[PDB]
Amino acid sequence: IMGSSVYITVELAIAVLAILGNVLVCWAVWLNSNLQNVTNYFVVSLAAADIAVGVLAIPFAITISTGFCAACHGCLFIACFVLVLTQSAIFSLLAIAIDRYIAIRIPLRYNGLVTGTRAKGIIAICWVLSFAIGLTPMLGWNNCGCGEGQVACLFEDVVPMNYMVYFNFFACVLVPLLLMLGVYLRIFLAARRQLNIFEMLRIDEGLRLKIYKDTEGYYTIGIGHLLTKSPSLNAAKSELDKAIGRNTNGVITKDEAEKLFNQDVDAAVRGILRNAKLKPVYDSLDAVRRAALINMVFQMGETGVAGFTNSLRMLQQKRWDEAAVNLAKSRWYNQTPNRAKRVITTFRTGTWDAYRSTLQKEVHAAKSLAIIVGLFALCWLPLHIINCFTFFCPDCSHAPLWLMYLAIVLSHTNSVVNPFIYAYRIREFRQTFRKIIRSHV
Numbered sequence: 001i002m003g004s005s006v007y008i009t010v011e012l013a014i015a016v017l018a019i020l021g022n023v024l025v026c027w028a029v030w031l032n033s034n035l036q037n038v039t040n041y042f043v044v045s046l047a048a049a050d051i052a053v054g055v056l057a058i059p060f061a062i063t064i065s066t067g068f069c070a071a072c073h074g075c076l077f078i079a080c081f082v083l084v085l086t087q088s089a090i091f092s093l094l095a096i097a098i099d100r101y102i103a104i105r106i107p108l109r110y111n112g113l114v115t116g117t118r119a120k121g122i123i124a125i126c127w128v129l130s131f132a133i134g135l136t137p138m139l140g141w142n143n144c145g146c147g148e149g150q151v152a153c154l155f156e157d158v159v160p161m162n163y164m165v166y167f168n169f170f171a172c173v174l175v176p177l178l179l180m181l182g183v184y185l186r187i188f189l190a191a192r193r194q195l196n197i198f199e200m201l202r203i204d205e206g207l208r209l210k211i212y213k214d215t216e217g218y219y220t221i222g223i224g225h226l227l228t229k230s231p232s233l234n235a236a237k238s239e240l241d242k243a244i245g246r247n248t249n250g251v252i253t254k255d256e257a258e259k260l261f262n263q264d265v266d267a268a269v270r271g272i273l274r275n276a277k278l279k280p281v282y283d284s285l286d287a288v289r290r291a292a293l294i295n296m297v298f299q300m301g302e303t304g305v306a307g308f309t310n311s312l313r314m315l316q317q318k319r320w321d322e323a324a325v326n327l328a329k330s331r332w333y334n335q336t337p338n339r340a341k342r343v344i345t346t347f348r349t350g351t352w353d354a355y356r357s358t359l360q361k362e363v364h365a366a367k368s369l370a371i372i373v374g375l376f377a378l379c380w381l382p383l384h385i386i387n388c389f390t391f392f393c394p395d396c397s398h399a400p401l402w403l404m405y406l407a408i409v410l411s412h413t414n415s416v417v418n419p420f421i422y423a424y425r426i427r428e429f430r431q432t433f434r435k436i437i438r439s440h441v
């Protein structure tokens, strides 16, 4: 085993793997339209970046390890590309994470704030900013045996540490991690929230934090809390302040929406109790099943719920399974099956299972970010930690050599693992990949 021959061979194996693993991703999305959401637009960009490292950044990172003599700007150029090609991969990961953040926490505005048009504009940013940082030394932030105007072509020789540590590390690689981490937790915390009536109707009707026009052009906020039928947005905003009790500018917090929602629930219940046909059924239900009945009122109305004479009878007799089947035959179930299905299950079980199941999609995304952040940090932290010690403790006992180059190997391993791992974990790709493998191979 010659020391570095091993190192180069790994880098080349990564090149192939990086290329191959990434050639697949962009290919799948090409022929399957289910994978042509705005999100996979971000994916194809990352995949392409990770292809570019396999062809140019890898051979460059390798050729920066020989020490041949060449113009400082000609050897800096090479080190700058490998920097640039990697900056993009870092920022491209942000595009995916933040996209997954809004899709989970703010699903309504997703299509509004996240259009296929805008997305392509955000990638343009990620790529330009990558150039801005990687090519900073070429602007003048550099460090310039062999002859005049020729240095030993070595990374540290041409790239100072005050750039790698202060600017590159903290501003370009670290704040991703801290950001990408914040995404993981806040998504994670959303998938594991304690369930209740408020969250229940947030899933069926959707939560709104800014005033919006309902389906009939009446200003509404929260979960279907109408403000006024007046055609004046200023009038609607005024009414909001009356209920909130402060200056809102047309915007409220999540807690304020829950106080409006709670007031609305208290109102629906008082109406149910006035109904000679709904009060007997309402009293004979436990807390969770009462939330299911309130859900039907918030959708149809008391007189509309009262129409279910038979299904209301079985409920008071606690014939849960029998009431469910009868509710399945209603026009209400036929016009909105998804919501009615979750509501019926709540009647059957008296639990939040049907809605808890709705969050399985959330935890899938959470577990999928644990991996991206874990690998990303595992692959990037080592090499940069090494840079820091060299910069702050020159006289220290440097870490072992063979290990140093491994850290370099880890940084490049990110390009092949990170994009493919996200795709392969979301099965729609898996079926698409196998389809390609058998058909063309």
Ligand SMILES: CCNC(=O)[C@H]1O[C@@H](n2cnc3c(NCC(c4ccccc4)c4ccccc4)nc(C(=O)NCCNC(=O)NC4CCN(c5ccccn5)CC4)nc32)[C@H](O)[C@@H]1O
Residues within 6 Å of the ligand: 061, 064, 065, 082, 083, 086, 087, 154, 155, 156, 168, 173, 383, 386, 387, 390, 398, 399, 401, 404, 405, 407, 408, 411, 412
């Ligand atoms: C996120 C933005 N992008 C990147 O981070 C990408 O840029 C590359 N990179 C990023 N830091 C890199 C980096 N650190 C600095 C460098 C270093 C650190 C301390 C002291 C000297 C050099 C290092 C080299 C190897 C591994 C890790 C870091 N050295 C290289 C890069 O090729 N070195 C190879 C060419 N030099 C050398 O063998 N010198 C030798 C190293 C061993 N001896 C030592 C060691 C300790 C103390 C004294 N003498 C003598 C000089 N490449 C890097 C890499 O491709 C990353 O993915």
